[PDB]
PDB file of C-alpha atoms (C1' of nucleotides) in Angstrom:
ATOM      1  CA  UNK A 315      11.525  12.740 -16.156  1.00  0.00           C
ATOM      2  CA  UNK A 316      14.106  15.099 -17.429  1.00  0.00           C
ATOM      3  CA  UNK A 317      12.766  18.345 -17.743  1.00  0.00           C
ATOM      4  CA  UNK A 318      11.772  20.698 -14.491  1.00  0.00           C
ATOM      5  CA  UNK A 319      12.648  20.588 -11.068  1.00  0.00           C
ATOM      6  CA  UNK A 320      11.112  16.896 -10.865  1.00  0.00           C
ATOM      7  CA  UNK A 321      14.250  15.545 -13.455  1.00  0.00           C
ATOM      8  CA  UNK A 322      16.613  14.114 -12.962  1.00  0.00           C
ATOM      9  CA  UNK A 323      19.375  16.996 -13.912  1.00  0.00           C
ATOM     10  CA  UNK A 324      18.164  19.095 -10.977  1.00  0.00           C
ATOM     11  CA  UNK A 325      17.009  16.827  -8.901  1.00  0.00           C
ATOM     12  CA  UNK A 326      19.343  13.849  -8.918  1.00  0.00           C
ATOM     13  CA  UNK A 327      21.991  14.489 -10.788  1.00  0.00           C
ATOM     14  CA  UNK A 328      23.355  18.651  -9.809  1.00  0.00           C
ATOM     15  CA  UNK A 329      22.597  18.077  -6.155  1.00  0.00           C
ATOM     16  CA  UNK A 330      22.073  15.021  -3.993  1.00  0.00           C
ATOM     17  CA  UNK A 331      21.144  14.200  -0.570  1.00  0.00           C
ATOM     18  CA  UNK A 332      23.997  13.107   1.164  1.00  0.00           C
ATOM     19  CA  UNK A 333      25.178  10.334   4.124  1.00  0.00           C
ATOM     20  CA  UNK A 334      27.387  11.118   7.322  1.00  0.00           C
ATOM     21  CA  UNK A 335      24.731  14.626   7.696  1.00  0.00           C
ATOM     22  CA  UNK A 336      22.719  15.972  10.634  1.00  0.00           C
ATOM     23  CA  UNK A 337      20.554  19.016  11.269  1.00  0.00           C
ATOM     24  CA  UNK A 338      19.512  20.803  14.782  1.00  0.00           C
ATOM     25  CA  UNK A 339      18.065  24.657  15.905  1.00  0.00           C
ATOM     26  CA  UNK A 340      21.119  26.971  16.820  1.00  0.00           C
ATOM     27  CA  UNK A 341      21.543  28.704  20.014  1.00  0.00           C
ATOM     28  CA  UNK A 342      24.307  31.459  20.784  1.00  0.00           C
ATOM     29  CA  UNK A 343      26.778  30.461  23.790  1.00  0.00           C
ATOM     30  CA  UNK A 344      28.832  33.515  23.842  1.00  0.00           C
ATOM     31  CA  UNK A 345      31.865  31.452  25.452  1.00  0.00           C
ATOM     32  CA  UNK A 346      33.605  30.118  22.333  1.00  0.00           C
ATOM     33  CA  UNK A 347      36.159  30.717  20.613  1.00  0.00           C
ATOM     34  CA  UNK A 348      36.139  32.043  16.947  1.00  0.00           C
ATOM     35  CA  UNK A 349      37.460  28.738  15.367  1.00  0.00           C
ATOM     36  CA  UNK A 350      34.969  26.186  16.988  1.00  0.00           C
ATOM     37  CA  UNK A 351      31.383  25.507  17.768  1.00  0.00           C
ATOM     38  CA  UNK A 352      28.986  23.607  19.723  1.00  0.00           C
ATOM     39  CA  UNK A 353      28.134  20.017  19.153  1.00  0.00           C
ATOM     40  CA  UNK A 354      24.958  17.845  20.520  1.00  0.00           C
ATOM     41  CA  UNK A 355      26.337  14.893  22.510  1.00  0.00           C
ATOM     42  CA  UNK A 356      24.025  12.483  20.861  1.00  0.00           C
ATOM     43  CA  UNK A 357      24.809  14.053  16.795  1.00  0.00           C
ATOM     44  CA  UNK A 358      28.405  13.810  17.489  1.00  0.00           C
ATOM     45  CA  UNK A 359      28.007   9.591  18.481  1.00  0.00           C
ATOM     46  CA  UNK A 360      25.745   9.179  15.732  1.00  0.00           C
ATOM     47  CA  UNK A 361      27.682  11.253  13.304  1.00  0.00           C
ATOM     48  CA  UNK A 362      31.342   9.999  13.475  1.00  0.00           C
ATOM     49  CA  UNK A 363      30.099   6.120  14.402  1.00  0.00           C
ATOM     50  CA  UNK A 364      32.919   4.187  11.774  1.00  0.00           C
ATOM     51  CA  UNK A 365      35.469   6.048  13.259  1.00  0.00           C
ATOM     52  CA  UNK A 366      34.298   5.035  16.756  1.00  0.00           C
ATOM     53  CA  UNK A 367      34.272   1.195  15.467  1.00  0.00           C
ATOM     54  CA  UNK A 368      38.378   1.619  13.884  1.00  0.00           C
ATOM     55  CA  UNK A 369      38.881   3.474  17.353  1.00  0.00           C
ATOM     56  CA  UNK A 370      37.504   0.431  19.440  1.00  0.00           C
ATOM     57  CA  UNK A 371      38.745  -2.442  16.961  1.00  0.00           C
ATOM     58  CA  UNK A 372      42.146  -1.011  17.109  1.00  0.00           C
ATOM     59  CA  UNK A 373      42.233  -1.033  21.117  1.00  0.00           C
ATOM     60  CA  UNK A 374      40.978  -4.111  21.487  1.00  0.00           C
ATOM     61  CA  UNK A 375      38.268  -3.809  22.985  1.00  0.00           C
ATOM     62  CA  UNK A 376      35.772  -5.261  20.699  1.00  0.00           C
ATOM     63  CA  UNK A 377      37.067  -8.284  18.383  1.00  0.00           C
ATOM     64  CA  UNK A 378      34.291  -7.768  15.480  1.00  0.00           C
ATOM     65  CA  UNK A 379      32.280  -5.458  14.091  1.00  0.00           C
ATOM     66  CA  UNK A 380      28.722  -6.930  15.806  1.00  0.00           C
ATOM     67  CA  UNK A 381      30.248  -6.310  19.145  1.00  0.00           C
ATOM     68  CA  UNK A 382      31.726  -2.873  18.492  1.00  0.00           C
ATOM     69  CA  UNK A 383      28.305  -2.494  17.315  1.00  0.00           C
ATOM     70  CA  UNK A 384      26.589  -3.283  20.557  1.00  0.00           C
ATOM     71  CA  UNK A 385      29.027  -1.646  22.528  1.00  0.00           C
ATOM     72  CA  UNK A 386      27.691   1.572  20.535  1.00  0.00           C
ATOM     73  CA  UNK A 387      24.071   0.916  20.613  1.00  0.00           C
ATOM     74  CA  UNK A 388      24.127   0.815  24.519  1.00  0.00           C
ATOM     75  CA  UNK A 389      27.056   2.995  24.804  1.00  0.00           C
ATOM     76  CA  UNK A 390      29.481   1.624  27.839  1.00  0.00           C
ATOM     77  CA  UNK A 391      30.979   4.631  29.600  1.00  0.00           C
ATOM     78  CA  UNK A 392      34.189   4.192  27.823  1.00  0.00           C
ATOM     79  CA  UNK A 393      32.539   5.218  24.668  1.00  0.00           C
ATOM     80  CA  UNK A 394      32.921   8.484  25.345  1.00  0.00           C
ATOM     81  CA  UNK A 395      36.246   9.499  26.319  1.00  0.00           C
ATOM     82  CA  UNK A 396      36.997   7.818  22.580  1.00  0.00           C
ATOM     83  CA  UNK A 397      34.608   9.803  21.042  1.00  0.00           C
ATOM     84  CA  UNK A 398      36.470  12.819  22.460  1.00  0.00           C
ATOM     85  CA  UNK A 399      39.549  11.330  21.549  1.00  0.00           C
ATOM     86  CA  UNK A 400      38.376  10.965  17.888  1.00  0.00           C
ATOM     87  CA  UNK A 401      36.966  14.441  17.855  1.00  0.00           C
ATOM     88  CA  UNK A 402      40.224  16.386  18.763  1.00  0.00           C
ATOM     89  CA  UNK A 403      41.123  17.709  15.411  1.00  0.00           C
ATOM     90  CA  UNK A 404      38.086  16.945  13.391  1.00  0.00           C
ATOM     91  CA  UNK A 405      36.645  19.890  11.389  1.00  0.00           C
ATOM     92  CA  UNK A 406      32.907  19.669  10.183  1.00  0.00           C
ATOM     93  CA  UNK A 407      30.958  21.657   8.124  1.00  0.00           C
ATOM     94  CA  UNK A 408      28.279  23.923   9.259  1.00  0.00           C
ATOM     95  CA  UNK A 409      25.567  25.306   6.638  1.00  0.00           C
ATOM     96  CA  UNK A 410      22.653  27.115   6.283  1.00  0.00           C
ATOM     97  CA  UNK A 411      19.294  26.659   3.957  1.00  0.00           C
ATOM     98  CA  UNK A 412      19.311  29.484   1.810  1.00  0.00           C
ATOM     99  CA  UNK A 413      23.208  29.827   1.261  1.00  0.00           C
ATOM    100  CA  UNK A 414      23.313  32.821  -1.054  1.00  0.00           C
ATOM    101  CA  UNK A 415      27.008  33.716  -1.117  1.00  0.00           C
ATOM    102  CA  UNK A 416      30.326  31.448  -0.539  1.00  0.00           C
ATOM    103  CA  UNK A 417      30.420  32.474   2.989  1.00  0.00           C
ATOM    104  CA  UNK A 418      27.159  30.429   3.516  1.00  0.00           C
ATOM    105  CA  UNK A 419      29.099  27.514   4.144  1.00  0.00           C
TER     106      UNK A 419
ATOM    107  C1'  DG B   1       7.394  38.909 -54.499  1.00  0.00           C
ATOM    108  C1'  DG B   2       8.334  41.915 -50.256  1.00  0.00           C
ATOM    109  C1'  DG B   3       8.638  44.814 -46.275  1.00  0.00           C
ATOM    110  C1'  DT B   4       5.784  45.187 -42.820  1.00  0.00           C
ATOM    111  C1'  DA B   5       2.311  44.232 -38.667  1.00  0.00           C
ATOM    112  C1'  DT B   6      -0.303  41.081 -35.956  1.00  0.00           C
ATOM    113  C1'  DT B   7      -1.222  36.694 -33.915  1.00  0.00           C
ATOM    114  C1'  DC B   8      -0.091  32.022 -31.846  1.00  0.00           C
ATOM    115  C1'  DG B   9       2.173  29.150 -29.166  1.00  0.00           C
ATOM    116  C1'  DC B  10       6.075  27.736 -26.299  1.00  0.00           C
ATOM    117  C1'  DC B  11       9.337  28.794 -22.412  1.00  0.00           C
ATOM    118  C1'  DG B  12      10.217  30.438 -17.612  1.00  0.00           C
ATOM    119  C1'  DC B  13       8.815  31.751 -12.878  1.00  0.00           C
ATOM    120  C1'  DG B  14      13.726  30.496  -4.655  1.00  0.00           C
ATOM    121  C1'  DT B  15      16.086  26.948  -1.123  1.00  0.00           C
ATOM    122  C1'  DA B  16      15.874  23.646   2.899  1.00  0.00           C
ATOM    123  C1'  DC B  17      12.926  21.192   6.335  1.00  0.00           C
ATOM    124  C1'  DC B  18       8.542  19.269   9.450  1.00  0.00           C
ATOM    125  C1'  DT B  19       3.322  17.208  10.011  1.00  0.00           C
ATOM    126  C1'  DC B  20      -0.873  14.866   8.016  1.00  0.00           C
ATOM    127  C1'  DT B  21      -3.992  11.934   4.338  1.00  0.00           C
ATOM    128  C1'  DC B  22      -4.889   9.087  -0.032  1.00  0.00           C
ATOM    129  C1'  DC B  23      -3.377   5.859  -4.205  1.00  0.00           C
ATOM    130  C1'  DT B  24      -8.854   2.909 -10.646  1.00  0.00           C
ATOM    131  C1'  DA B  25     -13.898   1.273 -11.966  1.00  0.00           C
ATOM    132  C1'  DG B  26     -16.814  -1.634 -13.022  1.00  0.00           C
ATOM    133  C1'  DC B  27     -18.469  -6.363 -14.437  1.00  0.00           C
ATOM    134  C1'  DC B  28     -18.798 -11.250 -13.528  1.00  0.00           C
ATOM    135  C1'  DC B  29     -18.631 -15.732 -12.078  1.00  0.00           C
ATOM    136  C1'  DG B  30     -17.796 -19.143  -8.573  1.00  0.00           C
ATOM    137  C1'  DC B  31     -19.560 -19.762  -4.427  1.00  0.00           C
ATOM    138  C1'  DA B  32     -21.530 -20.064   0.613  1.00  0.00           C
ATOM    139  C1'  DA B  33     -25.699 -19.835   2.871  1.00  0.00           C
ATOM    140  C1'  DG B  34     -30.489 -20.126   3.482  1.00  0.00           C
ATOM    141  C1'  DT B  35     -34.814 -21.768   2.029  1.00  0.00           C
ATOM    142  C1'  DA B  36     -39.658 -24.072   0.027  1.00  0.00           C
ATOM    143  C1'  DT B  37     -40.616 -28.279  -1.808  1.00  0.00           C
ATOM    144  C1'  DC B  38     -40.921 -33.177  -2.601  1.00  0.00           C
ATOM    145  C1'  DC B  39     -40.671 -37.640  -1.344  1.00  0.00           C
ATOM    146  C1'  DT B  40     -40.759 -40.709   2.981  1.00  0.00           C
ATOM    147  C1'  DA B  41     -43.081 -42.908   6.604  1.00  0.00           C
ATOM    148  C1'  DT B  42     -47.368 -44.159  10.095  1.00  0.00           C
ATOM    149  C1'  DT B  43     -53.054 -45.018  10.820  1.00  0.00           C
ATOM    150  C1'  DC B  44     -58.159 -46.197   8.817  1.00  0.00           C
ATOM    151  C1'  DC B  45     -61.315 -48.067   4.760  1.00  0.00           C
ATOM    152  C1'  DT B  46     -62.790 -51.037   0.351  1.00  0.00           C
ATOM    153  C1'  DT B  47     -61.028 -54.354  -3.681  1.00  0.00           C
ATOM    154  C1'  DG B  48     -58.854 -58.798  -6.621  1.00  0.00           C
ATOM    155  C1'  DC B  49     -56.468 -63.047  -6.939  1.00  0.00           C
ATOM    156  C1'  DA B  50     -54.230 -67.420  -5.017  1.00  0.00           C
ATOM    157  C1'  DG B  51     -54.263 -71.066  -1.631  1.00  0.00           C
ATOM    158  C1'  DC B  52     -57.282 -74.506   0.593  1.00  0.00           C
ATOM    159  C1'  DG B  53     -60.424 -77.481   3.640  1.00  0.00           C
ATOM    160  C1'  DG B  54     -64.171 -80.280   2.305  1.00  0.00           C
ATOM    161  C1'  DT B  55     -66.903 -82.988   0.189  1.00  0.00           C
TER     162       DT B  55
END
DNA sequence: GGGTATTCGCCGCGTACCTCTCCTAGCCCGCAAGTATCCTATTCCTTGCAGCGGT
């Protein structure tokens, strides 16, 4: 349980799996920019859900967690314009399986 | 002893993800269910002993 790819020092302990993560296929969309990409609707309301809950708590809109909850689950129009509003400056990471070199990443 | 050759055994061999299936063997003892058997009655006949009129 130690030794190998099975233990836990290269399995476990070096690299882990990892929360807050998604993964999709890539297509090309020749119309951005250099400094941004392309992001599913439904990744980007599962992916950044907490910040969606301190966006809603903080407008008053939902007094609790349970109904900030809901209000997410069935998604009320107003959920999105927030989620744009929490995405405006928020960089994520985009990588690929077999990241040889630092510029995988 | 000692420098050398030959053999034996251990160590190692890419990353990330998706789909599916299967995961101990054998004995044993209580136990439910189903059954063949054994005791239980009825009808006929021929005895053995106790009451009982009769004188």
């Amino acid at each position: 349980m130690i030794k190998g790819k099975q233990g836990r020092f290269r399995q476990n302990l070096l690299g882990k799996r990892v929360d807050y993560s998604g993964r999709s296929v890539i297509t090309v969309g020749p119309y951005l920019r250099l400094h941004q990409c392309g992001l599913p609707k439904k990744m980007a309301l599962e992916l950044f859900k907490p910040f969606i809950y301190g966006k809603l708590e903080l407008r008053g809109l939902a007094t609790t967690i349970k109904a900030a909850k809901k209000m997410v689950e069935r998604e009320e129009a107003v959920v999105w314009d927030i989620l744009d509003e929490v995405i405006r400056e928020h960089p994520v990471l985009l990588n690929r399986a077999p990241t040889l070199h630092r510029l995988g990443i």
